[PDB]
Design a binder for this molecule. Structure first.
Ligand SMILES: Cc1ccccc1NC(=O)[C@H](C1CCCCC1)n1c(-c2ccc(Cl)cc2)nc2cc(F)c(F)cc21
Lengths: 12, 230
């Protein structure tokens, strides 16, 4: 949850 | 030796992902066109940096083997390199050739952008050091990949898996340095030595941003994740 936008972009 | 068929493939492929970035002129045109207030510059900086992190994630995902890394490790590498990648790209843009008297004006405008005097000094010292290396587009692309796949990063669980991915790029960069500058068998080590100055921008990035001469410091949510501000 801390780096949720970053994890989202790495997965996508 | 020369670049092997596999090394030319890797280089051209890194070059292609690297070129997806916002063009230098699109950045320097705006700064040179007119002077802006410190508040206007702070918003130009945040929007440029949000775009840059976005493109950097796409660049990173294309790095051979990055996708096969542990997911927590993938995050640690992105978070650990974003500020350095931004300042290396800012150094690449700063040292690009422009008409007579333009670089002087670009440097004056950045200097008066709203950034604190404490930071102007190490920033310009680094940009000029990069300038003295006369790096090629390929060298900036490989250096950026090398910065990203740094195994000596904080919170990396499997360093050797990251080392395995960095080493082949370090080899292409070394061969390139030997060819482009036979006149400096120090070129490879100078380029690697600049990478140590780059890390210093990590410690003071938050303070550099918070000391911008503006009343309010708003960042985008993607920048709060990466920069650890707000
Ligand atoms: C952010 C980003 C991403 C990608 C490419 C370039 C950038 N960089 C920027 O937009 C800012 C702008 C911003 C607007 C004010 C003037 C400096 N910027 C900085 C810089 C200063 C301070 C900090 Cl804290 C960070 C960077 N050094 C620069 C050197 C350059 F030649 C240049 F053209 C722009 C430069």
């Amino acid at each position: 949850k801390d780096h949720q936008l970053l994890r989202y972009l790495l997965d996508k | 030796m020369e670049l092997t068929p596999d090394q030319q493939t890797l280089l051209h492929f890194i070059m292609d992902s690297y070129n997806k970035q916002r063009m230098p002129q699109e950045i320097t045109n705006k700064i040179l066109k007119e002077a802006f207030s410190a508040e206007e510059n702070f918003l130009i900086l945040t929007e440029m940096a949000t775009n840059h992190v976005q493109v950097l994630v796409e660049f990173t995902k294309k790095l051979p083997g990055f996708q096969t890394l542990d997911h927590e490790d993938q995050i640690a590498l992105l978070k650990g390199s974003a500020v350095e990648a931004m300042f290396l790209r800012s150094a690449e843009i700063f040292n690009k050739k422009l008409p007579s008297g333009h670089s002087d004006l670009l440097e004056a405008r950045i200097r008066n952008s709203g950034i604190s005097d404490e930071y102007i000094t190490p920033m310009f010292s680094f940009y000029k050091s990069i300038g003295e290396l006369k790096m090629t587009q390929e060298e900036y692309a490989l250096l950026t990949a090398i910065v990203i796949l740094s195994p000596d990063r904080q919170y990396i669980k499997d360093r050797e898996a990251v080392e395995k991915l960095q080493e082949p790029l370090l080899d292409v960069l070394q061969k390139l340095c030997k060819i482009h500058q036979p006149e400096n068998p120090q070129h490879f080590a100078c380029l690697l030595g600049r990478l140590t100055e780059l890390r210093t921008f990590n410690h003071h990035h938050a303070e550099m941003l918070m000391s911008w001469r503006v009343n309010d410091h708003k960042f985008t949510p993607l920048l709060c994740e990466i920069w650890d501000v707000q």
